[model samples]
Target chain A: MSGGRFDFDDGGAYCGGWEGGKAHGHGLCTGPKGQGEYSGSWNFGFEVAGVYTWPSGNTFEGYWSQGKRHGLGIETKGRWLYKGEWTHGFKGRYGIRQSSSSGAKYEGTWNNGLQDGYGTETYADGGTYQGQFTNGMRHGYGVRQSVTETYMGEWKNDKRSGFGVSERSSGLRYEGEWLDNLRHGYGCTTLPDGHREEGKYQKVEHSVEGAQRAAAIARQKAEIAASRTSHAKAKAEAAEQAALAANQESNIARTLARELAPDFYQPGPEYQKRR
Target chain B: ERIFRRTGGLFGQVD
Candidate 1:
């Protein structure tokens, strides 16, 4: 058939054009699980010249050599678009790849489908890592620019693993040796003034001073609560003492009235003398 | 160092 439905004996189906009883020309391959489908031109019994959609909704619309994506093409998936060169089914040529998954974009050369060579990766939150890439990870001297902190240093496997300078947005700078993205060797945090905090990298905890300040604030709140409880207790005790004293005074006044009355007749005593 | 050179160039069209 020119372009019709062709079901295979192995439960595979092709619904498009054919050439010489093979899946050729423009065709739609409705495959099983992962055999996938190509909705474009297929030459030489393979999906080589048109849009090849992966089973996971990723589409590669470009050149294919020997059933693999070769030459220029654009791969798109879930709001991500990569338009650039391809070499043997990998992102070998440069592509301005955009990702909606994390709002990330990578612009650089790739090796074997991985972000290798020199490239710049920009995150959606206005953060960026621009430098050398080895197997899709930051592996050399690069700069990590963030909202309030910027570090330009050496990295290994995407972690800061060498000497570097980290500058806070508040004009303070920390110079030190970093291992796994934390200070691990001798380092010093210096302000614009003469104030400086120096220590070992392993001794350098993440924001120790900030933690101390937070703890101090929490203690202040606790102190206020304790003081309030003590004050309330003192006030309650004073009220209880005053109430007890008033009761005693009331009893004393009643006894004094009874004792001073010479004609005040007692109920039983007056009844016997009522004649 | 073109990788570290500056952004806003290659992504100009992308934005």
Candidate 2:
């Protein structure tokens, strides 16, 4: 016979290409019960590339190396389908992952079998986010757009934090600090009519405390201007006092001269000093 | 101010 078939004691079988009594070229192999089945190319006794169908209907179709799934491949488990590069039987590098049951899809880079690095995720509710990720969570800078509003900025642990800009569909926009997805710290809101209000925000409410803080900041600036004006006034008063003292001294000197020599005093405009 | 709604964890777990 040009080909050979081998049967295991557990009812598993391998039938396909055979060369020199070895499972070479192409072959189909099946395992007993939950062990699954494999059918595709083979080299000697090694699976070079094939489709492995598990007992639970999950399947992997891709290249293999050293009896493990490696390189490019498409793996389907339940309703989830992942098509991308694989490393040592684990999902690695870039790929597109989708869950048909949830209507959620992710296309991005991966590491350690998780969504890591930069990627874009379209949620089940028509919302989307494009940004950096860590351990499958949104982290670092990103842009997330939902049905109600759109936000662009820093994110921490999947929550809006640090600095960012958010815009509503109704022509309302806010730009400033945020914490735990709430408007906190200082920020400015602009209306559709080009009017904008800048002040401190507390949590999720616009309260009197925020207004008070704004007022306090304004008062500090006003006090600075007032101090500068007072300094200018004091300088002017000093110059006026000096002018008055000079006039008094000249008048006293003229009186003393007249007293010393009565003839030196002329009771006319010619006798007056030129100054 | 309104808080931005987060739609995370919406996807089913990935294996």
Candidate 3:
């Protein structure tokens, strides 16, 4: 009879053929990490009949090609399950991908393991952002909704950029330019009282002159600060240098006078100098 | 009757 691999009675160790040899064809392997049984064709040194399961309760059961997790496979981990196409043990193209781990599901086009094209990301907190994606970040046009508000606009790197409108839960609304998800540039916010602030915005700050006016104000403020700082620094440096030079000169003069002038050098009288 | 009918038709068409 062909030696078949079997686990210990207590399921602690693996014993039988292919223990140290190649796990060829129908065999069983058990370890502290997990237990798995394989049966099928055997190649030079690889298990043709492939079924693998880890001790962490992760399993992949399906066809295998060239020792890689290829072909159709049913993978299950807790409540999450994936039954579809796989490539080398990863979620491959054309598959029914799902998850019960909350916000762990995508049913759309994927490029290089990232949700590309049209997709929806449902958050665990009842928030969702569904739209086009470029390079894994929300790009192009999309709509984002939360429990408190909904925004429809263009997105860049997952932040609200370009033109868009936001409808708040309180019936307030804002439509305008958004930079890094904040109201920036030109837009209008309709207040609940029917009054509205329609104009230019800069860095989330409203501009009285709107964008044009705000740009002017910003430029003026920057110029004023620069001019003031430069003037102050120049004045301080000049004053410091002047004081240092005065002190040095005074010290030098005192040293020179002390060294060169003798007690009777005044020429008034030798007796007066001595006194 | 004719006058009423004509007035009704006129109102429907015009007004």
Candidate 4:
């Protein structure tokens, strides 16, 4: 049928140019009423650039290759909308996905319909996570921010692991080792004032062996304090000045930890803690 | 034996 229309075996109809009895040129095809419809260009019975509509009211308008969605396209499915590059009908390469009802959005590279590579996810509550992802989970270094606190560290399987820094809006801060989102291993907690606590932490909750280590560190601090008792005021002033200087240098080191140290099991020599 | 002195803040500190 070069210029005439033909009906399909499954109660569908096609109206367009035909070459060797195959859909070729611009055409319109429709399934049984209330089912589906497709309108666009075709090549030897293969779908090319066009619009595809499903029975659920979902629609995709973009380029197609060999009967599959390819290249750039915009898809609307229920309350979710996706506009980006496609690879064989899957969200791949760079794209943006938005959920209208939840007010959440994701803009980044994707693979096999999952978030991969570097991406930024904006949550419904205005919180955000910017970092690398693998298989839809935070698997590399990233920065997660919320209303009360912000975490900049390495993430594995979506949990904060390896070296990282967490700062709270209340002036409390922690910098050190983290595993499974808990403050484990050696770490330092800085208070609002000049007070600081540095010791080995066992999941941050009370541990018997952990208590003894804390006790030992406390005893060491006491001895150091006693030694400096005679010049307490002057030493205190000197310590405050030194703390300020150290804070300025810490930013550089943090950047190195994020960029240089990619694997937690094999940290750089400079990052290793002395026994 | 003398221990190497560690400087800076939380990162790269020996204690």
- Reference-based lDDT, residue A104, model 3: 52
Measured with C-alpha atoms, the lDDT of residue A181 in candidate 4 is 92
In TM-score terms, which candidate is top? 4
Please identify which of the two predictions, 1 or 2, would achieve the higher lDDT against the true structure: 2
Candidate 1 lDDT by residue in tens digits, A1-275: 35455455544445554556555545444444314444455553655455554544555555656556676666666677676667767766465577867877877667788877666678999687766678989876666779688776667898877666677788798776678988777677788675888777444454444323333433343344334334333433443343343333323322332444333221212222322
Candidate 2 lDDT by residue in tens digits, A123-208: 99988777667888877777777968877776789887777778888879877677999988777787988798866775423433
State the displacement of the C-alpha of residue A203, model 1, in Å, after optimal TM-score superposition.
Answer: 17
Candidate 4 CAPRI-style tier: incorrect
lDDT digits (tens) for residues A6-87 of candidate 3:
3344443322224234433333333332233222333334433334445443555555555555555555566666555455
Error of 4 at A171 (Å): 2.8
Q: What's the CA error at residue A67 for candidate 3, in Å? A: 3.0
Q: What clash pairs does model 3 have?
A: A185-A201, A200-A210, A200-A211
DockQ of 3: 0.00
Better of 1 and 3 by DockQ: 1
Q: Show pairs that collide, candidate 4.
A: none
CA error at residue B14 for candidate 1, angstroms: 35
Flag regions of model 1 displaced more than 4 Å. Answer: A1-6, A15-24, A33-35, A54-56, A79-81, A202-275, B1-15
The total of clashing pairs for model 3 equals: 3
**Superior by lDDT: candidate 1 or candidate 3:** 1
Residue pairs clashing, model 1: A184-A201, A185-A201
Computed on C-alpha atoms, the DockQ of candidate 4 is: 0.01
